[PDB]
Design an enzyme around this catalytic site. Structure first.
Site, PDB file in Angstrom:
ATOM      1  CB  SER A  61      -1.271  -0.049   0.988  1.00 42.63           C
ATOM      2  OG  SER A  61      -1.499  -1.082   1.624  1.00 42.63           O
ATOM      3  CE1 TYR A 147      -5.950   0.363   1.968  1.00 40.38           C
ATOM      4  CE2 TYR A 147      -5.546   2.733   2.377  1.00 40.38           C
ATOM      5  CZ  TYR A 147      -5.077   1.301   1.978  1.00 40.38           C
ATOM      6  OH  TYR A 147      -3.724   1.335   1.459  1.00 40.38           O
ATOM      7  CG  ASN A 149      -5.964  -2.527  -2.884  1.00 39.11           C
ATOM      8  OD1 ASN A 149      -5.535  -1.458  -2.339  1.00 39.11           O
ATOM      9  ND2 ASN A 149      -5.740  -3.631  -2.338  1.00 39.11           N
ATOM     10  CB  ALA A 315       0.621  -4.976   4.656  1.00 38.39           C
ATOM     11  CG  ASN A 340       1.356  -7.922   6.699  1.00 39.03           C
ATOM     12  OD1 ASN A 340       1.677  -6.882   7.418  1.00 39.03           O
ATOM     13  ND2 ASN A 340       0.673  -8.033   6.016  1.00 39.03           N
TER      14      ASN A 340
END
Lengths: 357, 357
Positions: A61, A147, A149, A315, A340
């Protein structure tokens, strides 16, 4: 490396690594504008390769600050406008829903509920189009942040359309290059395979998997030295030559929305400085970070404020990263690992070092 | 002065002058960056004083540009925000209507109907306070553009609040000075008295009358040389030393609203380029220029576009002025007259020249 720095560093990162069980980590401290690098562990555990300043890590990210700047550039170049509707760049995006959904919404997750991840079934651009067409929103655009993608990702893809360039080709030529980001990749070239660290998940060496809108949402790989420049750049954009990039950066750190004590920029995220470490630390929790929150719109926006704590976490399945800096103090840090681990962990470590100055 | 500058100028202005019966005028053309001055007639008829490039003219509403840049400055300075409520800076401004009225509204004539002019019976800060307390809107904030002094005028007064400076002090120090505008005044110093033109109205020599908010809405007096610099600056704000002035500038040419083929900036007005002369010529007419118009909100705004036709007209009782530039072409012009004459006359004249290059 001034002692005090070395100090807070060893104090702080050693235990983090030991606790988290992180295989490799690289750390940079920008103090009064200059970087200071720290390295530990393994890039390749079984090959016994160490983590060096040339080690490439999957930013996950963190890629989003890239994409946000690249779009800030596109704006600065007059090629796109945040105020434009999505359909203007994707005509075939016929669904009504798409109605009042702007580039801005896409870029800042305020579109009304687009998904965090893009379905793994969605392979083709075609699949892609069904996907977006068939999506119906839960909220009015510009009312709630979620949030995702599939949101900033789409924004990325579209923002480069006028340029005629591919997402990665624009990135390269438009950001990396001018910034001398010589070891930053979307795709990592063979020449750098040797320096490409392994991610670790449940003790398995791993690399980011391929998927729709990956380059755009999470495809960047970098080194600490590069990340360092990335930081300086963002710290003091006025010093970069490309006028558009310079403007792009400032656009990415402008404040478009507020949710709590956080401000949503383009890719980046800000809070006023001095901060309250709690807010930051706890806020990093994916339990908070990934949630659906109501937004306040900033009309018109607030241009990049020097007095902010700017930052971002990212991550991938085998990596975890974090970035942060205080423009006003000429201070920031970058932390990259081949594992991560809990965000909050990253932010607190970040908060100690910086807080120590 | 390259010939085809002197040409188009004489060709165009000389007549304009004869035509409108203007006593003294000064013109400047900015070509490929450089300035070229043109002068004619008198400044003081009786006295037979010729207009020189040291001759001061009442810019009337052109002031507003200064107000706009001074305003964007303050924002660059983290000193104010356009998204904030009026009351925040004028707390005694308690009446309900003031509710959702932001600084933005104020700066852009979008508040819902503030009057073009501040009644002349309004003398004290008190008088001023009643005035606005009792003012009732015609529309909702952010719905209609209605050109007004009482609007932007108050924007200008408040925007300087937090700096603690007087409006004039701030302008001088923040704008005039850094730009080297050595002969630009709100109040004219005695030593400048001899270079200060008289205005002419009905065959009378006149100077602007004092008024509430005059400084902010129409109080500046300037020379062509200075106006020139004003122009250059505006053409290439990226060259300004002062970071906040430099941003202020680009803030003042950002597009906040659209109405027709026009976009409202801070003080400044712009249209894309190539522009349609008709629209600009006809728009300049008060019948249109002073008329309410529904605005469309640019969400978020568009940062200054290089391919624009940017300009502003202005007048006082005995003076008429106009400025226009095309940032992309490194081209612009200024016309200063000691008489208020038809705007469309100014815009056309201007267009001819600029259109000629």
């Amino acid at each position: 490396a001034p002692q005090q720095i070395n100090d807070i560093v060893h104090r702080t990162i050693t235990p983090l690594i030991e606790q988290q069980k992180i295989p490799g980590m690289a750390v940079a401290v920008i103090y009064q504008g200059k970087p200071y690098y720290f390295t530990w562990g393994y890039a390749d555990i079984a090959k016994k390769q160490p983590v060096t300043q040339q080690t490439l890590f999957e930013l996950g990210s963190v890629s989003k600050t890239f994409t946000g700047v690249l779009g800030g550039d596109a704006i600065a170049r007059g090629e796109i406008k945040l105020s434009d509707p999505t359909t203007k760049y994707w005509p075939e995006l016929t669904a009504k829903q798409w109605n009042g959904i702007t580039l801005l919404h896409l870029a800042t997750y305020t579109a009304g509920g687009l998904p965090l991840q893009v379905p793994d079934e969605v392979k083709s651009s075609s699949d892609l189009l069904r996907f977006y067409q068939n999506w119906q929103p839960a909220w009015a655009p510009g009312t709630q942040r979620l949030y995702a993608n599939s949101s900033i990702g789409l924004f990325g893809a579209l923002a480069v359309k006028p340029s005629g360039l591919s997402f990665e080709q624009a990135m390269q030529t438009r950001v990396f290059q001018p910034l001398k980001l010589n070891h930053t990749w979307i795709n990592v070239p063979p020449a750098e395979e040797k320096n490409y660290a392994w991610g670790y998940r449940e003790g398995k060496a791993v690399h980011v998997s391929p998927g729709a809108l990956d380059a755009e949402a999470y495809g960047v790989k970098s080194t600490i030295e590069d990340m360092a420049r990335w930081v300086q750049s963002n710290l003091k954009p006025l010093d970069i030559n490309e006028k558009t990039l310079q403007q792009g950066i400032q656009l990415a750190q402008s404040r478009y929305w507020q949710t709590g004590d956080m401000y949503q920029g383009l890719g980046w995220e800000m809070l006023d400085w001095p901060v309250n470490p709690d807010s930051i630390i706890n806020g990093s929790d994916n339990k908070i970070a990934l949630a659906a929150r109501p937004v306040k719109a900033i009309t018109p926006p607030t241009p990049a404020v020097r007095a902010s704590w700017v930052h971002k976490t990212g991550a991938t399945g085998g990596f975890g990263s974090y970035v942060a800096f205080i423009p006003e103090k000429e201070l920031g840090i970058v932390m990259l690992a081949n594992k991560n681990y809990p965000n909050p962990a990253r932010v607190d470590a970040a908060w100690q070092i910086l807080n120590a100055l």
